[PDB]
Design a protein around this ligand. Structure first.
Ligand code: FBB
Length: 167
């Protein structure tokens, strides 16, 4: 048993809810929250901007030190950093950004990072301002992630379309 509440069960391991991931993280304090990161860990907008704002910019300060030491992530890659006030850990995962012309085949590689963690609170990778079709992102998630993933979908309209179209 875990602390996640109000989720619809899609599969053995994937759950979904219409929820702001910031507010969900603040309530649950999960072991792992996933950020929709870019390779520079520049948390300007979308999920990343909202998570970083909720940490009072501490996520960005930590991220800048990480990049100064290690250089940029790979598209499809990830790093584990602090979860600050939101979670124990933040798994920063880089899905491909369609609005930059990145290979959508890298979305499966991105979701494979989730398998290193038994339970995660996450957004749909490459959705929102990353430009991919969220229906596709949910299909790749279900077909790739084997650990227990609690997906927060911010937009109520999109949530209802994801559920009602799910095979
Ligand atoms: N407070 C929140 N802002 C965003 C922005 C984008 C998003 F996909 C999810 C959320 S939750």
């Amino acid at each position: 048993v875990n602390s996640f509440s109000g989720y619809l069960k899609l599969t053995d391991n994937v759950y979904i809810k219409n929820a702001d991931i910031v507010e969900e993280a603040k309530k649950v304090k999960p072991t792992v929250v996933v950020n929709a990161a870019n390779v520079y860990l520049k948390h300007g907008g979308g999920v990343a901007g909202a998570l970083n704002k909720a940490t009072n910019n501490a996520m960005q300060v930590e991220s800048d030190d990480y990049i100064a030491t290690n250089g940029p992530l790979k598209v499809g890659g990830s790093c584990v950093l602090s979860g600050h006030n939101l979670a124990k850990h933040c798994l920063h995962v880089v899905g491909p950004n369609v609005n930059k012309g990145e290979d959508i085949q890298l979305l499966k590689s991105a979701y494979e990072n989730f398998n290193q963690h038994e339970v995660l609170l996450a957004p749909l990778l490459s959705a929102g301002i990353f430009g991919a079709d969220p229906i596709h992102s949910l299909r790749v998630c279900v077909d790739t992630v084997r650990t227990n993933v609690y997906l927060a979908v911010f937009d109520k309209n999109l949530y209802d379309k994801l559920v009602s179209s799910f095979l």
